Amino acid sequence: NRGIESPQVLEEHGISVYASIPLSEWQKARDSQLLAVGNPTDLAIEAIRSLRTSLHFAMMQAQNNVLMMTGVSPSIGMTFVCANLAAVISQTNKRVLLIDCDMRKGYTHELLGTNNVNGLSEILIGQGDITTAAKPTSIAKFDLIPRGQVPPNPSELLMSERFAELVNWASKNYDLVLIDTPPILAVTDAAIVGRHVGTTLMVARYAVNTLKEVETSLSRFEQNGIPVKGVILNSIFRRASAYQDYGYYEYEYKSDA
Amino acid sequence: FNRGIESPQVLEEHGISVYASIPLSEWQKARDSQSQLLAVGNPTDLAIEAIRSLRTSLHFAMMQAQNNVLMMTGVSPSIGMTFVCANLAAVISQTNKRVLLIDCDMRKGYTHELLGTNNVNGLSEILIGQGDITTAAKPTSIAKFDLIPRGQVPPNPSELLMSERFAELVNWASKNYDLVLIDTPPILAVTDAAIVGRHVGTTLMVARYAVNTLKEVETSLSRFEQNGIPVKGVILNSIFRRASAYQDYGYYEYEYKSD
Amino acid sequence: NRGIESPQVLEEHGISVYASIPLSEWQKARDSVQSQLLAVGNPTDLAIEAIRSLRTSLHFAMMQAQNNVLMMTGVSPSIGMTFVCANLAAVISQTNKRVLLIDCDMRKGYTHELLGTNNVNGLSEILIGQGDITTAAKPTSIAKFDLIPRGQVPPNPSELLMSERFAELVNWASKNYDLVLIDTPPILAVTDAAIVGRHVGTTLMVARYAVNTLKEVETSLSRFEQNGIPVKGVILNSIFRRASAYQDYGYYEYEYKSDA
Amino acid sequence: RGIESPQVLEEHGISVYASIPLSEWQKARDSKQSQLLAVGNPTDLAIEAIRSLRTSLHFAMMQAQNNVLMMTGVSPSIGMTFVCANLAAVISQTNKRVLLIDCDMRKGYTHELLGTNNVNGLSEILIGQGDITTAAKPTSIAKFDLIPRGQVPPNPSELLMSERFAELVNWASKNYDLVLIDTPPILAVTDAAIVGRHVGTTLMVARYAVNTLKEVETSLSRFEQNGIPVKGVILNSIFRRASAYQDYGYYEYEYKSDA
Amino acid sequence: NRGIESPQVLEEHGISVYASIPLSEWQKARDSVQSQLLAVGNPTDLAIEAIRSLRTSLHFAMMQAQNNVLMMTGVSPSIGMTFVCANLAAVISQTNKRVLLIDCDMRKGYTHELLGTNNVNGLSEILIGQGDITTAAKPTSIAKFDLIPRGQVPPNPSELLMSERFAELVNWASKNYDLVLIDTPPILAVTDAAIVGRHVGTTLMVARYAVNTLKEVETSLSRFEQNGIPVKGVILNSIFRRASAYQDYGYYEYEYKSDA
Amino acid sequence: NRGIESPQVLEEHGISVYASIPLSEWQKARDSYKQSQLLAVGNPTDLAIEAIRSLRTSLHFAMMQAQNNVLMMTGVSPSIGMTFVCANLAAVISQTNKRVLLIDCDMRKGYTHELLGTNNVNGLSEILIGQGDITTAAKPTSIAKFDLIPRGQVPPNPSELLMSERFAELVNWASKNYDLVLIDTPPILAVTDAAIVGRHVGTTLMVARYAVNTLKEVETSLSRFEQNGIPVKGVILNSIFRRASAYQDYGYYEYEYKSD
Amino acid sequence: NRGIESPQVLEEHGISVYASIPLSEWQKARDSKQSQLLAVGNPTDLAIEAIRSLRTSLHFAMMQAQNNVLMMTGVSPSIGMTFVCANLAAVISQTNKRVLLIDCDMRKGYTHELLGTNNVNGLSEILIGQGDITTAAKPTSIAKFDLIPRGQVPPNPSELLMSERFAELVNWASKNYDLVLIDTPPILAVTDAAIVGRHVGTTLMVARYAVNTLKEVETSLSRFEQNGIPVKGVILNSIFRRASAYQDYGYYEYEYKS
Ligand SMILES: Nc1ncnc2c1ncn2[C@@H]1O[C@H](COP(=O)(O)OP(=O)(O)O)[C@@H](O)[C@H]1O
Ligand SMILES: Nc1ncnc2c1ncn2[C@@H]1O[C@H](COP(=O)(O)OP(=O)(O)O)[C@@H](O)[C@H]1O
Ligand SMILES: Nc1ncnc2c1ncn2[C@@H]1O[C@H](COP(=O)(O)OP(=O)(O)O)[C@@H](O)[C@H]1O
Ligand SMILES: Nc1ncnc2c1ncn2[C@@H]1O[C@H](COP(=O)(O)OP(=O)(O)O)[C@@H](O)[C@H]1O
Ligand SMILES: Nc1ncnc2c1ncn2[C@@H]1O[C@H](COP(=O)(O)OP(=O)(O)O)[C@@H](O)[C@H]1O
Ligand SMILES: Nc1ncnc2c1ncn2[C@@H]1O[C@H](COP(=O)(O)OP(=O)(O)O)[C@@H](O)[C@H]1O
Ligand SMILES: Nc1ncnc2c1ncn2[C@@H]1O[C@H](COP(=O)(O)OP(=O)(O)O)[C@@H](O)[C@H]1O
Ligand SMILES: [Ca+2]
Ligand SMILES: [Ca+2]
Ligand SMILES: [Ca+2]
Ligand SMILES: [Ca+2]
Ligand SMILES: [Ca+2]
Ligand SMILES: [Ca+2]
Ligand SMILES: [Ca+2]
């Protein structure tokens, strides 16, 4: 039980790997901005496009257009996968709303070219109407409700009836609703949010998160009655390149002119 | 084994569900070197964040359990069942819920000292007849959080809990509050908890990290089963890290400091 | 199979351990001088606290049984079945219930000496036809706790318990009282307990800690099972602490002394 | 080899109904009995064991819905007459009218042992020279009657085969509280298997370190072959080997009464 | 395998041993000069006591089957199937019952010699044409014991038993007698017994101790089941002990001397 | 793991191999990258074409159990022969006097228009955007009852175009207007495209290259489909070659049945 | 799996061996493609006696099926499926039954040659549309035995068998004849048999002794089941003796003449 080296490791333990997102060297370079826009040919984006296809089917089964993105631990890319997925879904001619439920460390507004004025934090206490809430981002058909000002009681705010009101509104007013949450192993927040969502997906970093960590995470959700559809393996990289193997294998399918 | 529980997995594999894993707070242990309530004193604390996780687990667990009364019992003395209990009720009140804590430890109980309440006409006096059930509840330094302290130490604690006056009080509390939390003495020390357990809808057991043994936990659970008291799970209190690369081998606790 | 060292030993064999009574050093001191109840003399004692635990599990098991008569029998002599019996009745009386103890040990019974009563018109006299069943019960030094002592030692104890006059007394005792406790001689010594067991609703058996063997316990139970008397469980008396890491091994005992 | 424990038989699906110790008083007062131990030494552990057998018997007969009991043994001189006579004696002491029929028309001596004449006994009754009602003779023990063997016939097995035998047992059953039939050993003569057809409960005696498990199994086979159910086995003449804290198979406690 | 050494050997393989007849030294002596029949000559003999045990087993087995006809067969020749048969009938007549023995061994058969009867108009004659089924039975030296001897040796014994005249005789015998015993030749030598077996209600098989093998016994039982003839059990004849002990293995002889 | 060396390898893992296409030495020669010409036309006697004829026979039965005349041809990885198998299959199906339409859904690297002899004007790309009517779409190829809708001009959003309701409608039209519809798609392990297309098809078949694709690769591919509710009928093993010639054995065996 | 040397090998793998045809030394000698039909040339031959056993097995096997059409297919080429087929039909006609043999091997068929028939207007032609069904049938050198030969080699045999005209012919043949036998090319070489199999009531597979292996039989049955064609069993052709003993091992045969 070390850092997950293969999607098969968790697949064999009855944990379905919904997507295996490679490490984008373009993003890695820029970090030292939205990739779906910056470099749309990227294998990470092509993997997120696969995730969108898997989701469409998985959400027709759930019949609820709300989806939660949670992670195992902090800084594994759950905000990266979430923002880029919403971006890719909007490109399918669908009105997408992203709710940044990370009222502790959320920075969607910054990443999506939006102000943090009258965000989720404000909406939840009362100050700020639910209908007005949504803010347009640098991407067409993609709107965002940022975290708002950092509250002293994030978990307690999500516990309110005002949160269920907002999610219900969002569900009615948008084609798809994505909720970015803080990691389950750090704070309870995601479990609280999970009560209102129809589909839950969990991010795990490639050679970093352990099978025990993943199992513990999924346990916390079950314990609170939240079904998790599957796991997303982010920041995967090639090791033993053979004829593309080690469980990963990804092909450069470059279009013609 | 017959050695201190080193992992939640140890008791999970033996068919004992670990509902929460509370870390050892240094703020408490240092500001105790029991003193100040952590949930108020230091609300950012990892122990409080873990207790908030327990609150989330509880909400779901009792919906099916059906009875807003919850009992908190422990394996042995000084493991932190009063700490978990008081701090849980504090965190539940912060959810805009009417929380009543009943201190059933009429032997060593001190919740009234913790929560800033007098011990006049407590459980002891209100169980002997000396006080009225409706008047009983006392407001604490925390909003939406009320307490019925132990009262004066009686010569017959187990015998008082055995009375019909106890069932009357719990029934009242259930009707008058959103949630009822009952702090009891450890099961392995005194029978008290097994008497109280008859009136509760959900029972949770605290066990200290590298201190309580699997045999101790197994024995405790047996005493409850023997008295027809179902235990929903176990809470692992005072957990500490033993590693330092990709948090943290057997147990993991991440600090997600707000901006 | 050598002295029982753990409740788990017999637990694993199907034998339910209902209570594990520690060795009271207070009682040990007061004997080395039985005489005078421990439940009264030193009520804070761990043995009494263990006895209180037994009362709690008792309440449940007897509600299920549908009868208020409970027999206390042992495996062998001098294991503490009279000790557990008298102290349990004492502790049950403290629960605000009208409780009666019948001393069915017409051979070596001495409850009358323990509880402070005369032996006049004792069980012996009642069974022969001399004394009236309604008058029988005698008040003890403990409130809401009554006793029918053994009487003068008869030549035919087993034969007296075999009479219809015994069933009549137990029947009366069951009516009139909230709980009926019957102290009997050990099953492995004399047949007496197996005769008494026909009239009872819940049967409990005492076994001494590092003294009685699993084979002894199994044999005891087989005698009852052969006479159609179901035994609810076993009580492990005179348990003593051996280890000192995480309190103990087997049964760990905590000294929960009250505040102010 | 000789059955060293009750557990040996019990593990082979043979229930041990009682374990009668060796009577130190009876061996002394033999050095064919002829004193009944139940009378001469009533405190004896062998009798206390026979009293336990009486307790097992009632209930096992007040569930069989029959008052007739047969006592048979594996081999000669194991104590089946000893257990039988002493058991009847102990049952009569329970204020019950007991009849003992001595079906050992070969070597029977109950009349010598219980102080009765052998005039117009079982032998005579079956030949058709003596009335079934008149039959019963009072013994030296109150409420205890006996039908002795009578004069030794040339055809014992043939006489028990008669309808006169079934008539007598039926009469005995109607008149008396309990009917005990002492018979010769099954492994020696067929007699017991003939008698067994009229009894409601059958018990088999086996001598402690003498009779073998094979002998017991063979005996039980002969009965089931003749449709006679055997309720259990009685281990007679048991002795203590090493002291320890009661030892190997059997257990003995000297619970002597006060003055 | 080997000559059977224990009744348990048979019983282990599922073969019920109905009786274990010891070797009669009295017979052995009166043959080394059969004889003037053991049941009469020496009635106290252990062999006769064993045959009496067989009679007790039979009474239950036959009145359980509701048919008074019994066949006695054997595994191989000269094992004592005629010895066990004649002596059993003798012992059954002593129970005040009218017994008829039919000698179905029409090749070798010698009961009329042993029971002092003439061989005029025997089974052979009855089966061919006439001798009159009703007249057939002849009185033996033993009261309540009648015999139909083999008759003159026919050239077709198996063929005669195959006739409807045989079934007629057995049916008559069943109606006119309390018990019918049919002595047959060994199954492993001739088919005769399997033909006779169709008309009988109970079948018993004799096997010589230390001589007949388990394979022989199994083969014999197979031939019967192949012909739908149920065999109750096996009789172990000519048993002897291999020096005392506790009496073991399998065989135990207890002399139970009458005294007057 | 290592490249699949036997159809049995997959078969033992519960993956039904539907066809085992040999390596066309004729095709390998004419190629010298991309497929030079249609082998079904170029060399119709070729063992690869005979194997594709076997696939057609398997399909006829399998397609009609499904009731839907639309079939998708997807592969594990690029350059394994899924376009080769697809085009050649449709060619051999048209030879069965059936109206076949091939839709090249590879709007990234598609070249069916080059291979079949068609212009790329107003292709799938254009149709999906609006720049073409669905009912005009189909283009006749160099082969008889065989029509093709080529990729069209390379769009910047291929997966997004297949996601449209305009795609669903084209497939529905094609199904109504043709005897059967074959859809060539890009590899599943490279791009999501095939999983989008799979929603509209009635039968899905997957190509895997002989000693190249691994069992892990095949299992991963099949997982992606089931995750999107796309049932895969089986796997096609393309480019199989011999190592032996003993009795033709060691996984695969193919016979040179030359006509007279 | 090193070339079936026993009927038991197959039997143990749940594949029923319907017949075990020995190697005819008369035929082996006459062949130095089969020269002429053995059931006529040497009727006493053990191979023909084995084929008579196969006829007895089929009678029962075909009552079960209800359809009088039977297909003979093989694992690989030159194993004797044409030999078994022609000789079986010959032996069935000798049971005074009207037998029709259809040569579905439009690739390498030669039944017209060995049976003494012209190849004018064969199956190839009939399928093409030119040539009437009711005329198709040609009498052979054997009484009650008719044949419809392959015709001239077509460029599309698998495609011709795929036609509705084939189903029409089989249906006619069934309605008119007592028994219909269809000789096909090997399943492991060409798809032809799997196409034909849809119209037949009973399918039997030939496998050569010492040759053909167990994996070949396995993959041969697999291909049929994949196309919903039930195979009743396997025929082991060209079996030969190994020992010169006193009776055994896999096979054992006796010369039962006067
Ligand atoms: N697949 C990836 N390839 C390259 N960089 C990545 C990838 N996933 C995440 N990152 C980077 O990792 C960092 C943390 O990602 P983030 O979405 O903020 O994590 P989290 O939501 O878990 O707190 C960012 O700088 C992000 O660009
Ligand atoms: N998770 C924790 N971190 C730090 N100190 C703790 C923790 N839990 C309990 N304690 C400390 O343990 C001591 C006793 O706790 P208490 O609640 O009185 O135990 P109990 O009721 O189980 O007898 C106090 O010093 C309390 O602050
Ligand atoms: N748990 C105990 N601790 C101390 N002394 C005990 C305990 N149990 C029994 N004893 C002592 O053991 C002795 C015998 O007990 P008793 O009740 O008379 O036994 P029994 O009825 O089984 O013959 C008494 O002196 C009693 O005080
Ligand atoms: N438990 C016993 N203790 C002492 N002597 C015994 C015991 N059982 C039997 N005996 C003696 O054994 C002898 C034979 O007993 P008996 O009843 O006559 O045997 P059986 O009926 O088997 O013939 C007698 O002398 C009897 O007193
Ligand atoms: N148990 C026995 N003891 C002594 N002799 C016996 C015994 N059984 C049989 N015999 C003798 O064996 C001989 C053959 O017996 P028999 O009944 O004639 O055998 P079978 O009917 O098998 O031919 C006779 O002389 C008989 O007396
Ligand atoms: N069985 C085969 N035998 C010979 N060449 C083949 C075979 N299968 C595929 N090829 C060749 O492989 C190359 C790639 O095939 P292609 O159909 O374009 O693959 P894909 O669509 O999987 O990317 C072409 O040159 C094709 O002719
Ligand atoms: N059992 C046999 N004994 C001797 N020769 C045989 C046997 N079976 C087949 N042959 C010969 O071997 C060849 C097998 O080819 P054939 O019967 O035409 O069928 P196919 O080639 O279709 O498998 C023929 O030449 C035939 O004479
Ligand atoms: Ca984040
Ligand atoms: Ca406490
Ligand atoms: Ca006592
Ligand atoms: Ca006797
Ligand atoms: Ca004979
Ligand atoms: Ca392609
Ligand atoms: Ca051919």
XYZ file of N, CA, C and O in Angstrom, chain C residues 36-76:
164
model
N -21.743 -11.020 58.148
C -22.216 -9.682 57.699
C -22.010 -9.308 56.192
O -20.866 -9.196 55.727
N -23.141 -9.077 55.462
C -23.186 -8.712 54.037
C -22.241 -7.578 53.653
O -22.101 -6.587 54.385
N -21.575 -7.764 52.499
C -20.620 -6.832 51.898
C -21.340 -5.605 51.307
O -20.825 -4.493 51.429
N -22.546 -5.811 50.710
C -23.405 -4.802 50.073
C -23.787 -3.704 51.051
O -24.115 -2.586 50.637
N -23.722 -4.026 52.344
C -24.041 -3.147 53.462
C -22.746 -2.622 54.102
O -22.590 -1.408 54.238
N -21.846 -3.539 54.467
C -20.568 -3.230 55.099
C -19.641 -2.312 54.318
O -19.084 -1.372 54.895
N -19.453 -2.587 53.007
C -18.610 -1.802 52.093
C -19.302 -1.726 50.705
O -18.991 -2.512 49.800
N -20.287 -0.814 50.536
C -21.044 -0.774 49.267
C -20.298 -0.276 48.028
O -20.757 -0.514 46.908
N -19.156 0.401 48.220
C -18.325 0.916 47.126
C -17.467 -0.171 46.477
O -16.993 0.027 45.358
N -17.282 -1.314 47.173
C -16.489 -2.470 46.742
C -16.752 -2.894 45.291
O -17.909 -2.930 44.852
N -15.666 -3.210 44.555
C -15.706 -3.638 43.152
C -16.559 -4.886 42.921
O -17.147 -5.019 41.846
N -16.643 -5.777 43.938
C -17.439 -7.007 43.940
C -18.913 -6.628 43.913
O -19.689 -7.205 43.148
N -19.280 -5.605 44.705
C -20.650 -5.100 44.751
C -21.008 -4.388 43.446
O -22.112 -4.583 42.924
N -20.041 -3.637 42.878
C -20.242 -2.947 41.608
C -20.473 -3.953 40.490
O -21.305 -3.702 39.604
N -19.787 -5.126 40.582
C -19.908 -6.242 39.630
C -21.239 -6.924 39.801
O -21.840 -7.369 38.816
N -21.693 -7.001 41.075
C -22.976 -7.579 41.447
C -24.102 -6.707 40.882
O -25.072 -7.255 40.354
N -23.919 -5.350 40.911
C -24.856 -4.364 40.358
C -24.985 -4.548 38.847
O -26.083 -4.415 38.305
N -23.874 -4.912 38.178
C -23.843 -5.188 36.739
C -24.665 -6.420 36.446
O -25.378 -6.450 35.446
N -24.584 -7.424 37.348
C -25.331 -8.672 37.252
C -26.824 -8.393 37.337
O -27.582 -8.956 36.541
N -27.230 -7.484 38.256
C -28.618 -7.065 38.461
C -29.211 -6.472 37.164
O -30.358 -6.760 36.807
N -28.405 -5.663 36.463
C -28.766 -5.006 35.212
C -29.007 -6.030 34.111
O -30.004 -5.927 33.399
N -28.118 -7.019 33.972
C -28.282 -8.037 32.931
C -29.417 -9.004 33.274
O -30.008 -9.610 32.374
N -29.727 -9.104 34.590
C -30.758 -9.942 35.215
C -32.128 -9.467 34.815
O -32.934 -10.254 34.319
N -32.384 -8.166 35.042
C -33.617 -7.469 34.713
C -34.093 -7.827 33.282
O -35.252 -8.208 33.089
N -33.159 -7.781 32.317
C -33.371 -8.093 30.908
C -33.724 -9.568 30.680
O -34.733 -9.855 30.037
N -32.866 -10.490 31.167
C -33.006 -11.943 31.023
C -34.289 -12.508 31.642
O -34.833 -13.486 31.112
N -34.764 -11.895 32.763
C -35.973 -12.323 33.483
C -37.297 -11.847 32.877
O -38.317 -12.544 32.999
N -37.266 -10.672 32.200
C -38.390 -10.076 31.468
C -38.718 -11.031 30.312
O -39.894 -11.291 30.041
N -37.645 -11.604 29.691
C -37.667 -12.571 28.591
C -38.232 -13.930 29.046
O -39.068 -14.521 28.353
N -37.769 -14.411 30.213
C -38.139 -15.702 30.805
C -39.600 -15.888 31.162
O -40.081 -17.020 31.087
N -40.296 -14.813 31.585
C -41.709 -14.849 32.009
C -41.909 -15.789 33.236
O -42.476 -16.888 33.145
N -41.347 -15.332 34.366
C -41.316 -15.908 35.711
C -40.364 -15.007 36.507
O -39.383 -14.507 35.939
N -40.661 -14.776 37.799
C -39.842 -13.926 38.681
C -38.972 -14.710 39.683
O -38.344 -14.115 40.581
N -38.941 -16.045 39.519
C -38.154 -16.947 40.352
C -36.803 -17.180 39.649
O -36.759 -17.463 38.442
N -35.710 -17.001 40.416
C -34.329 -17.190 39.978
C -33.530 -18.021 40.988
O -33.415 -17.658 42.162
N -32.965 -19.125 40.510
C -32.161 -20.006 41.334
C -30.705 -19.696 41.137
O -30.240 -19.509 40.009
N -29.982 -19.696 42.240
C -28.553 -19.538 42.237
C -27.961 -20.858 42.692
O -28.220 -21.332 43.804
N -27.199 -21.466 41.809
C -26.543 -22.716 42.091
C -25.067 -22.558 41.753
O -24.689 -21.627 41.046
N -24.240 -23.416 42.316
C -22.818 -23.404 42.035
C -22.402 -24.706 41.400
O -23.232 -25.594 41.167
N -21.111 -24.805 41.087
C -20.499 -26.008 40.536
C -20.085 -26.910 41.726
O -20.568 -28.033 41.840
N -19.262 -26.383 42.638
C -18.723 -27.107 43.776
C -18.902 -26.311 45.082
O -19.211 -25.127 44.997
